[PDB]
Every structure is written in C-alpha cells, then in structure tokens.
C-alpha cells in the first residue's frame, strides 16, 4: 500500500513524562535495532511531514546509465603491415569501478539491461587525409558462438546474432535485454568453485578458480568498422553505457571499502588504508 | 538391440549427475539413475534422464558450473548365444527430448563456415 512518493510518518506532539516506560533503553545484543522516533527522547511538536523517499527507491538508485567499457577499433590503410583492429570484449560491469560498487550493496538481483553506444572517431596520421562517414557494427556473440577471427569473415553474416549497425554522427545506438540470467538472480558474488577437486584424479584436472562461475558469463561484444580500408588511418572508440531498469535486489552488504583489484573480492597491498587521521576529542 | 533372435541379455544403461568421479565400474553406475534392460521381443528400451540441475538452464557448451553428467551402459549378466550364431552384433542409439524440453537465446552455430 505504501508507495515511493508517499509522505513519511507524521511527528506527533509529545510532552512531559515520568513513567514505567523506557524508550531510551535497549541492548543491541538482541540484533534488533531500537526503533526510536523524535517524540521519544525529547518533547516534539506536531509536524505534518512532507518529505518522501521517492528518489531513494531501488529503481531510482540505479536510474543512471554507467560506463562499462571502452573498445578500440580502427580503419588502417590498405597498405599497412598490421591487421584492421576489431574489438572483442567480455560482457561485464566489473571492468570499471562505479557501476560495480553500486551493484555491490546487494547479494543478488534481477534487472533488464539497457545498452547505449556513444561512438567517437578521429584521424591518426599527420596527413590531411579524407574519410567518409563511417559505419559501425556491434555484434553480440553469446557464449560458445562463432567469435570473429578477422574483420571480414563469415561470422559477421550474423544470420542469428543480434547486431547493431551504427552510422557515425547520429543519435547513439540502443538496445534492451531482459533478465538473461541462468539463475533466478544474477550473483554478484559467488562463494565456491565450478569444479570439485577429486581424489582418484589429479590436482590439475580438478583445479578451479575461486569466486567464478558460468553465472556471470553471457557472451562478448565484437565491434568493427564495416567500411573497408581507406587511404587514411581512422581510429575509433566504442563506449558502452549500461543501465539497469526494473530492478530488484536481495540481502545487503557493506560497500567496497578499499580499492579494487581484479574481478574477485581480492585486494592489493598498500591500498589497505581507507581512512584518515582525526582526533577522538576534537570536532 | 541389433543381434539375432536367439541371442539374449540384460544391460544396465545409466545416468549419474555430475560433480564426482566418472564411473568406470558397473558398481558405481549402479548407484545412480539407471534402467535395467532386458533383451527380447521388444527390441528397444528407454532410460529417461530427468532434469536434475542446479540452474534453470545449462550452458550449451563445455562448462563446469553447468556440467551435465555421465551416461554409461554396462552388462547386467552378459550376452548369451547358442551354437551357429554370430558372436558379435551391433546396437544403435537414438537421442531425443521429452515434452518439457526448452531452449532460449538464439545464436549462430559453429558447424559450418564459409572460408574465402
């Protein structure tokens, strides 16, 4: 019945007291957090409260679109020794920090992912060379599907792979993907091992990395420049902005205190000092 | 079963969930989900591997977290034949899905490729 945009509990007028009631007294040993409102420890006037928790609702908290990855590609000359660089990226929020930390306050979740692609470009050589408006392809290769080998192989024919042809200089590309989780909720943390070391086997064959799983495996993105080789090398960056929408979460955890190090819960040394100096008896 | 009419037998086709030792002895495969099969007038049999998996769907690839298991066939007695009968024969297998079999998230296959 209570929604987000509802007014918080109205403060009630309270006066002098001398009773067998003990609001102020608790014992945090019970695990229970003592619920004390204003009209308890002090005499408060009647206040028709107006503040609402609207903007603090789960949906609202993650209501921004974060930068998950930067993918580099180019379009080098037909005469270059190197191959036309096409980008491949493992789909994950973890690569950066921000979006990750926010997703860390909870143990689990369900959310339809909405993606954004703000592509940029530029020349590289000190040549007054020309380049026509470039076309971009964003290709979603699910787990175990043909990942491209060249910038021009049968794979990009994508008879079944959902791709996005972006024409540079237009309103950024966008797609929506629902809950593709193999579970019931995507596990931001996972206490375990994909394999179980066995006894009539060898340490090699039953060794697995702690913390990982297939849960957080969804596929990779492959981006290229659909235009062929051009007389002037034109590099390009693909920024991916992800925004969780229609979100739910389960069981809170404390936010990441120290600086990140890897996709694991691991921490590097020298970054173990989160706080600063401040006296106990000084304001 | 594709052996003569005068040939007989009993076999133990089995299915054990994953996350343990792959069984190499009847005794172990016998400890799991199996269907003891008798060879007779009804030449074919069917063992149903019911869905017993951690997730709601498994990766179509070679991944451990979503690993499937182990299917194994073993002699429950042995093959018995009389005189004037071939001592060797063949058995064909046929895999299919049960009505509750479903799939999701379409992608491209790898079983074909256009090179050049």
């Amino acid at each position, epitope marked *: 019945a209570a929604t987000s945009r509802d007014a918080l509990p109205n403060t009630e007028a309270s006066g002098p007291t001398h009773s067998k009631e003990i609001p102020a007294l608790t014992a945090v040993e019970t695990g229970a957090t003592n619920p004390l409102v204003p009209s308890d420890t002090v005499q408060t006037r009647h206040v028709v409260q107006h503040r609402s928790r609207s903007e603090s609702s789960i949906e609202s908290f993650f209501a921004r679109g974060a930068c998950v*990855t930067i*993918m*580099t590609v180019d379009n080098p000359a037909s005469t270059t020794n190197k*191959d036309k*660089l*096409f*980008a*491949v*990226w*493992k789909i994950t929020y973890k690569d950066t920090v921000q979006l990750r930390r926010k997703l860390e306050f909870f143990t689990y979740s369900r959310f339809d992912m909405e993606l954004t692609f703000v592509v940029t470009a530029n020349f590289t050589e000190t040549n007054n060379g020309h380049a026509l408006n470039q076309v971009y392809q964003i290709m979603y290769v699910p*787990p*175990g599907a043909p*990942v491209p*080998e060249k910038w021009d192989d049968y794979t990009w024919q994508t008879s079944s792979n959902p791709s996005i042809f972006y024409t540079y200089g237009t309103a950024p590309a966008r797609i929506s993907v629902p809950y593709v989780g193999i579970s019931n909720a995507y596990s931001h943390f996972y206490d375990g*091992f*994909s*394999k179980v070391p066995l006894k009539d086997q*060898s340490a*090699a*064959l039953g*060794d*697995s*990395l702690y913390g*990982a*799983a*297939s849960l957080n*495996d969804f596929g*990779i993105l492959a981006v290229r420049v659909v235009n062929d080789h051009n007389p002037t090398k034109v590099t390009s960056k693909i920024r991916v902005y992800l925004k969780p929408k229609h979100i739910r979460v389960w069981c809170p955890r404390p936010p990441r205190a120290v600086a990140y*190090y*890897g*996709p*694991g819960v*691991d921490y*590097k040394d020298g970054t173990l000092t989160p706080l600063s100096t401040k006296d106990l008896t000084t304001y | 079963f594709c052996g003569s009419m005068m040939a007989t037998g009993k076999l133990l086709v089995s299915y054990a969930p994953p996350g343990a030792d792959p069984p190499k002895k009847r005794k172990e495969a016998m400890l799991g989900t199996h269907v003891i099969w008798d060879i007779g007038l009804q030449s074919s049999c069917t063992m149903v591997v019911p869905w017993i998996s951690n997730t709601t769907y498994r990766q179509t*690839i*070679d*991944d*451990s*977290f979503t690993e499937g298991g182990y299917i194994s066939v073993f002699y429950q007695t042995r093959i018995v034949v009389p005189l004037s009968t071939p001592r060797e024969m063949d058995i064909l297998g046929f895999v299919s899905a049960c009505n509750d079999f479903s799939v999701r998230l379409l992608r491209d296959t790898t079983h074909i490729e256009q090179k050049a």
Partner: nanobody, 121 residues
Framework: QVQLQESGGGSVQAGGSLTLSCAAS?????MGWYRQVRGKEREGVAF????????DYADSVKGRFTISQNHATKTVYLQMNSLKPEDTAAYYC?????????????????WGQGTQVTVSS
C-alpha cells in the same frame, strides 16, 4: 584484438625452476583462452580458461608446470620447476576465444614474440 608479450625468460641450470610472464593488451582475457605452447617449433604445454578453472597440461610435462591467471594485471604466467635439459625450448603464449581447440597449433589467432629459455647442463 589482444597483443601478447613473452617476458621473464632466460638461462638457468638443470634441476632448478624459472617463471615466465605473459602480459597482454586490452581487453586481454577477452579474447579468452590463454596458452603456453613450447617447442623449438610447435608443441603445447599448458592451456587455460579465462573463466572458471580450468586447467590441463601436456602429458609430457604433466605434474611440474602450472599456468595461472592474473586478471587484474592482465598477465598469464608459467611456473616451470625441476627443469631438465630437454626443457630448453622456444617459449610462447597464445589465445583464441573459441572455448575449445587446445590441440592444434594452427587453430590460434594470437601470438606473441617469444622468449628463449635455457636449461643449462
């Protein structure tokens, strides 16, 4: 489009141990499946999956080598112990996302420059 680099390789005696480092460009493990293929010419040693576990070693070296993943630095190593003269080979590192093909040298797409290791008798 990752770029490999073979570092931490050199001369040592017989019986000892040496470590090999393989840092990479990107967006590293994103091309997935890092490897260690020795031989003066071409022959595998270690193979590894960027996700999950997921080790496996060449029968010829089994139980003396280990390939590890440092996803933070983007470096894949190779701890070679109890070295023996037959270990003096041309070491390299590899990758292909294709979650399979670890038994074919020509199945790869990425290769580094290399580092000669010498198990001096």
């Amino acid at each position: 489009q990752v770029q490999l680099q073979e570092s931490g390789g050199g001369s040592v005696q017989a019986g000892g141990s040496l470590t090999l480092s393989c840092a990479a460009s990107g967006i590293t493990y994103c091309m997935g499946w890092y490897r260690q293929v020795r031989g003066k010419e071409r022959e595998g040693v270690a193979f590894i999956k960027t996700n999950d576990g997921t080790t496996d070693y060449a029968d010829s070296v089994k139980g003396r080598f280990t390939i590890s993943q440092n996803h933070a630095t983007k470096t894949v190593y190779l701890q070679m112990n109890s070295l023996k003269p037959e270990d003096t080979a041309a070491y390299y590192c590899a990758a292909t996302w294709r979650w399979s093909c670890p038994l074919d040298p020509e199945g790869y797409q990425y290769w580094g420059q290399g580092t000669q290791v010498t198990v001096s008798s």
